Design a protein around this ligand. Structure first.
Ligand SMILES: Cc1cc2nc3c(=O)[nH]c(=O)nc-3n(C[C@H](O)[C@H](O)[C@H](O)COP(=O)(O)OP(=O)(O)OC[C@H]3O[C@@H](n4cnc5c(N)ncnc54)[C@H](O)[C@@H]3O)c2cc1C
Length: 479
């Protein structure tokens, strides 16, 4: 196509949400998604979670996973039949959504409302969304290593990485994960379970004192490290990689403190950089504090260019300028971007949530500014039988926790197995709650949103914690 009315760059979560938002507000709209990957839009969270807890050899082909409750779901947002071909898109009655797979936008000419693809073709647009997501960080130690080291290092991001790494876990004796964050720890538990059944080894190493140690308070970071160790994973905290080489066919990791780790394959999960390469020819601002395209309240980066998802550095209604790596944010900001591309002129006021499941038994949710260097008030309780991701998925029918929590924010609230197993952690700044972590507490994110939006100087967080830990039959009106 040489001209399209709506052009979405990137075919991930934010792009799909915007495409559907445009079609709802502008029925008959013609929307083209350009996607460098071969697959139609799909969600990422199952790649590190339910797709590993199957023992079904066919999921690498069907990309249908069993949710924790046993209900199957496609990783794809919509089947192919939902889309029209790019060739038909200009002509077909009542418009549609087409995806040009296997094509990368390599240049964006803001001034001329035009993109250029890797195959040399050019497309002009009336409205454009940048939904390019991010690019995984590597380690300099792996960068300096040889081609073989790099060929045996997985930056875990996409379906292709699930497929290749799942095969490796069936075939090798030792896999090492570098990175202690949520994704690394999800993979550690996933691989850990596979290795326990096979008799093989999984190592996880990171520089913090314990898993998710930059986010969780020390008590709960250490508990998480022991949970991962009970899955059979050798967890090595306080580990700084100095070099990686090959010796006798195996990868040899040398840590700064002198320890060595011999392993067969490496998975690095040490974060990402927003993909801002299309800023290179001008017209688009970038953020240096956090990364990403700087956008205004309506998610605009230029007169007819919007940005959504991981690539956007947006103005958080509570926290100011920030970027997130949240499925929830990609969905909500993508939808809003699509609305503003059809003239809604609405600000992005959503408080994005995050969640991580380490398995059916352990999950976390996070909202706002969740930094372990802030003072935290943790209020903990014994877990009941329903305080785990599997029960939450059984109650709601989805494992996509932003869907079971919903995007909404509570408006009014009415109040009519050997130690701690859940709790709420309040992150304080200026005597105010600026972030919350929920540990095995589900269906209360709307309440966490309300507490953070109120921003009052709370005494008796002992009492507020009861809204998360204790009260069951709360009657709440959501918005
Ligand atoms: C393994 C994994 C597990 C996750 N688990 C969770 C979880 O449990 N909870 C949670 O809240 N979040 C989770 N996340 C984060 C969440 O998936 C992301 O926030 C979400 O994918 C962001 O969507 P996006 O559309 O902004 O970016 P993406 O979904 O990455 O989409 C970007 C797409 O655009 C393509 N692209 C980039 N540049 C170009 C270009 N120039 N031309 C064409 N195409 C281009 C990319 O190849 C990619 O397909 C997880 C992420 C990963 C990788």
């Amino acid at each position: 196509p040489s001209h399209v009315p709506f052009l979405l760059i990137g075919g991930g979560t934010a792009a799909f949400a915007a495409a559907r938002s445009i079609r709802a507000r502008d029925p008959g709209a013609r929307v083209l998604i350009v996607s460098e990957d071969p697959e139609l839009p799909y969600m990422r969270p199952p790649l590190s979670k339910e797709l590993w807890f199957s023992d079904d050899p066919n999921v690498t082909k069907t990309l249908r996973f069993k949710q924790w409750n046993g209900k199957e779901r496609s990783i794809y947002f919509q089947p192919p039949s939902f889309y029209v071909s790019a060739q038909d898109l200009p002509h077909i009655e009542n418009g549609g959504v087409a995806v040009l797979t296997g094509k990368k936008v390599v240049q964006l000419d803001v001034r001329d409302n035009m993109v250029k693809l890797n195959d040399g073709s050019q497309i002009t647009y009336e409205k454009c969304l940048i939904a390019t997501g991010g690019t995984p960080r590597s380690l300099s130690a792996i960068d300096r290593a040889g081609a073989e080291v790099k060929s045996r290092t997985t930056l875990f991001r996409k379906i292709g990485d699930f497929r290749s790494l799942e095969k490796i876990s069936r075939e090798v004796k030792s896999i090492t994960i570098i990175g202690g964050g949520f994704l690394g720890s999800e993979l550690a538990c996933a691989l850990g379970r596979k290795a326990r059944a096979l008799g093989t080894e999984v190592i996880q190493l990171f520089p913090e004192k314990g898993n998710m140690g930059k986010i969780l308070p020390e008590y709960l970071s250490n508990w998480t490290m022991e949970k991962v160790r009970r899955e059979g994973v050798k967890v090595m905290p306080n580990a700084i990689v100095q070099s990686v080489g090959v010796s006798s066919g195996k990868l040899l990791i040398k840590l700064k403190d002198g320890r060595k780790v011999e392993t067969d394959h490496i998975v690095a999960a040490v974060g990402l950089e927003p993909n801002v390469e299309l800023a290179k020819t001008g017209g688009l601002a970038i953020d240096s504090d956090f990364g990403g395209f700087a956008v205004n309240a309506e998610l605009q980066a230029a007169s007819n260019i919007w940005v959504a998802g991981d690539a956007a550095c947006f103005y958080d209604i509570k926290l100011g300028r920030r970027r997130v790596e949240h499925h929830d944010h990609a969905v909500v900001s993508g939808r809003l971007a699509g609305e503003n591309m059809t003239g809604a002129a609405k600000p992005y006021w959503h408080q994005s949530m995050f969640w991580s499941d380490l398995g059916p038994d352990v999950g976390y949710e996070a909202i706002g500014l969740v930094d372990s260097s802030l003072p935290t008030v943790g209020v903990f309780a014994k877990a009941t039988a329903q305080d785990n991701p599997k029960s939450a998925t059984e109650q709601s029918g989805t494992g996509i926790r932003s869907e079971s929590e919903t995007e909404s924010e509570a408006s009014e609230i009415t109040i009519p197995g050997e130690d701690y197993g859940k709790g709420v952690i309040f992150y304080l700044r200026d005597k105010v709650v600026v972030g919350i972590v929920l540990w095995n507490i589900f269906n209360r994110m709307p309440i966490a949103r309300k507490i953070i939006k109120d921003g009052e100087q709370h005494e008796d967080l002992n009492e507020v914690a009861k809204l998360f830990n204790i009260h069951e039959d709360l009657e709440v009106l959501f918005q």
